[PDB]
Design a protein around this nucleic acid. Structure first.
Ligand SMILES: Nc1ncnc2c1ncn2[C@H]1C[C@H](O)[C@@H](COP(=O)(O)OP(=O)(O)OP(=O)(O)O)O1
Ligand SMILES: [Mg+2]
Ligand code: NA
Ligand code: NA
Length: 314
DNA sequence: GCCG
DNA sequence: CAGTAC
DNA sequence: CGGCGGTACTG
């Protein structure tokens, strides 16, 4: 973890991202990672241009930060960028909505509150704006997962509940809590969302819903808001997925991430004429589902050594 | 932005 | 669907 | 030249 050039590239990357240039931002992201994972601090355009994820343009940027101490592009970042970042940090608003609000003359969250048309999701995002930008201590994510597990296992004690995401990857803090739920009998997972969510509502634990198709008996996810009881508590984002046991390993792998790790893994599967998703590991263009009873089986079928969750924190 |  | 989200 | 993971809600 030994480069200073990435600090400058990070600003450009974020600038491109909030302005909607998502593929250019991805290229910066991959390069920033390539720079982060190099041994010696790069000192040559040739040395830089050799690195995978770094091309002529990125090398030149590097060759300027080394031989000048600065990146000229950083002085010509659009003035809109910090406001675009402010707006897209509202949950449920992305770059398109942020750019529309900016075009309409809005410059602050007060402008948004008083003058913007907000979706139901965005109104919830705005009212929890600071809280959703916080990370919680690992210990708090444990309490939240346990709250969900207790409510679930009260209804069916055979239900398996696992906190995934950054929590399973062992991080000291968590942006939210990601809970996977399944049942080993392969059937009793069906239709339980209404039951589980109603239970968590009865005791006031859930405070708002963001994404929750409860009219669908095949509902796959709940994205919402919770808050533990007592003083000193903030509102926290809570994501729940309910999956068939036959998809456990792929769902676990997906939900544990990281996101970058998932993208890398799926890209690798595609090179081998396979396809990897939260549902299954399959073959080429419908395709054949491969047997993956455990995460280790997914690595194996892809010709990879098993990585522990903590080693997937890419 | 990068890569094939 | 486009947007936003995981 | 043109894709870059693959998928699930919302309105
Ligand atoms: N774009 C994505 N593509 C594929 N998988 C994703 C994507 N985004 C999120 N996931 C998967 C992997 C993530 O680890 C998991 C949970 O998402 P998320 O809660 O945003 O991240 P996280 O739990 O890893 O970190 P954080 O602490 O910020 O919440 O869902
Ligand atoms: Mg998370
Ligand atoms: Na947002
Ligand atoms: Na709903």
């Amino acid at each position: 973890h030994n480069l200073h050039i990435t600090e400058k590239l990070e600003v450009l990357a974020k600038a491109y991202s909030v302005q909607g240039d998502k593929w250019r931002a991805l290229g910066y992201a991959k390069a920033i990672n390539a720079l982060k994972s190099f041994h010696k601090p790069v000192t040559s355009y040739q040395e830089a241009c050799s690195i995978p994820g770094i091309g002529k343009r990125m090398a030149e940027k590097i060759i300027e930060i080394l031989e000048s101490g600065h990146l000229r592009k950083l002085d010509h970042i659009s003035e809109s960028v910090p406001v675009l970042e402010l707006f897209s940090n509202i949950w449920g608003a992305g770059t398109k909505t942020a750019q529309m609000w900016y075009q309409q003359g809005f410059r602050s969250l007060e402008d948004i509150r008083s003058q913007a048309s907000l979706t139901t999701q965005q109104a919830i995002g705005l009212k929890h704006y600071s809280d959703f930008l916080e990370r919680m201590p690992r210990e708090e994510a444990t309490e939240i997962e346990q709250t969900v597990q207790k409510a679930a296992q009260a209804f069916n004690s055979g239900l398996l509940c696992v906190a995934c995401g950054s929590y399973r990857r062992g991080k000291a803090t968590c942006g939210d809590v990601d809970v996977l739920i399944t049942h080993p009998d392969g059937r009793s997972h069906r239709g339980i969302f209404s039951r589980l969510l109603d239970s968590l509502r009865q005791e006031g634990f859930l405070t708002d819903d963001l994404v929750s198709q409860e009219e669908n008996g095949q509902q796959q996810k709940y994205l919402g808001v919770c808050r533990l009881p007592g003083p000193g508590r903030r509102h926290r984002r809570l994501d729940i997925i309910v999956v068939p046991y036959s998809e456990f390993a792929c769902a676990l792998l997906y939900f544990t991430g990281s996101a970058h790790f998932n993208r890398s893994m799926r890209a690798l599967a595609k090179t081998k004429g396979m396809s990897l998703s939260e549902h299954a590991l399959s073959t080429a263009v419908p395709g054949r589902v491969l047997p993956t009873p455990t995460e280790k089986d997914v690595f194996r079928l892809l010709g990879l050594p098993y990585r522990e969750p903590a080693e997937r924190d890419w």
